[PDB]
Amino acid sequence: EMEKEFEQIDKSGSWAAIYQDIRHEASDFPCRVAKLPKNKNRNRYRDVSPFDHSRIKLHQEDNDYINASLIKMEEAQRSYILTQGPLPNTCGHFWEMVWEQKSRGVVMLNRVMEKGSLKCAQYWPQKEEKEMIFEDTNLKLTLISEDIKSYYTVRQLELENLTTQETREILHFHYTTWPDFGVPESPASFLNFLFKVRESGSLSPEHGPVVVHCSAGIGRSGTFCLADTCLLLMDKRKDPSSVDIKKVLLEMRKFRMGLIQTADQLRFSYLAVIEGAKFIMGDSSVQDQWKELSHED
Numbered sequence: 001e002m003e004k005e006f007e008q009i010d011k012s013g014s015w016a017a018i019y020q021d022i023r024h025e026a027s028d029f030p031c032r033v034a035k036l037p038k039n040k041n042r043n044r045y046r047d048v049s050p051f052d053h054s055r056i057k058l059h060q061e062d063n064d065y066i067n068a069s070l071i072k073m074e075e076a077q078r079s080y081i082l083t084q085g086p087l088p089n090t091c092g093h094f095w096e097m098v099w100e101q102k103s104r105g106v107v108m109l110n111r112v113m114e115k116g117s118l119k120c121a122q123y124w125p126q127k128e129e130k131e132m133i134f135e136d137t138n139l140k141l142t143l144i145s146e147d148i149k150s151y152y153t154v155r156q157l158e159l160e161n162l163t164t165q166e167t168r169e170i171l172h173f174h175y176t177t178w179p180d181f182g183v184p185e186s187p188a189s190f191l192n193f194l195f196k197v198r199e200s201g202s203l204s205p206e207h208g209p210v211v212v213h214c215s216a217g218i219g220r221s222g223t224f225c226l227a228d229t230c231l232l233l234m235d236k237r238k239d240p241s242s243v244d245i246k247k248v249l250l251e252m253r254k255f256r257m258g259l260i261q262t263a264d265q266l267r268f269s270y271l272a273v274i275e276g277a278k279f280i281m282g283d284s285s286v287q288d289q290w291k292e293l294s295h296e297d
């Protein structure tokens with residue numbers, strides 16, 4: 001169905017119309033807390049807000065607000081937290097959220113500078129010997145190691161609750177070559193990275209939801225989660241034909257606005273899912289193929 005649909009859309013060249021259709025149907029819920037005056041400086045973009053019903057609340061009495069949404073995919077049985085790139089004033093909240101939600105993985109799909117502008121704060125330590133303390137949320141963060149590939153880096157971080165002295169390992173997955181409002185180089189490079197996240201165990205139901213972020217937390221992040229959810233649905237039923245990508249996206253859009261930002265990002269999601277289906281249905285060669293085609297070395 002999906003590969004048929006994909007061919008029928010490319011032929012008619014109607015990706016824009018298909019994408020706009022989803023924009024039209026998409027849920028609309030209030031974002032009243034996000035729009036409170038006291039939270040203006042907690043939002044990176046005026047027009048990108050978490051719905052009240054699905055927002056992550058910080059466990060504090062001062063101000064519980066963070067620009068983050070819990071995407072809870074009931075049928076798939078996987079949850080994601082989509083959030084904006086933290087601001088210089090919300091890095092402590094970002095890590096507070098990771099701690100409180102018991103996340104094991106953070107997926108970052110942007111660079112700190114893109115198109116000459118700063119799309120995200122430097123919210124993690126770049127050097128082992130220079131750890132970060134977030135005074136406001138009483139948290140310590142230390143770079144333990146990093147594994148740099150050509151187009152993505154995986155970092156091991158240690159997060160410490162300074163109140164309890166409890167520590168956890170966070171894995172940081174940083175895709176560095178995904179342009180804003182753009183698409184990955186190929187399905188292969190995208191899937192190579194997604195499977196890295198998967199193979200880390202960071203997506204396990206044993207943990208809290210993985211935190212996923214680019215700059216606004218909706219375009220690239222939306223693309224990432226849609227592809228992952230569709231592959232997981234397909235996997236559970238071992239039935240690629242049972243997956244309706246647009247339906248999955250619309251469901252996801254119940255939890256955060258604007259997920260997937262361009263028609264081509266939607267088109268790419270189809271490509272990645274169709275290609276990833278090969279692995280799901282038992283082709284044990286494609287994963288090595290993606291690794292080679294990704295040029296990660």
Ligand SMILES: O=C(O)COc1c(C(=O)O)sc2c1sc1cc(NC3CCN(S(=O)(=O)Cc4ccccc4)CC3)ccc12
Nearest residue numbers: 045047048119180181182214215216218219220257258261
């Ligand atoms: O590929 C990417 O990751 C692109 O990421 C983005 C940016 C970046 O600099 O990286 S800026 C930006 C996005 S997405 C986005 C959306 C946006 N506004 C959208 C938000 C979603 N809506 S909606 O879901 O339709 C609800 C709505 C909100 C406001 C007005 C009208 C409707 C459409 C406008 C403004 C800036 C940005």
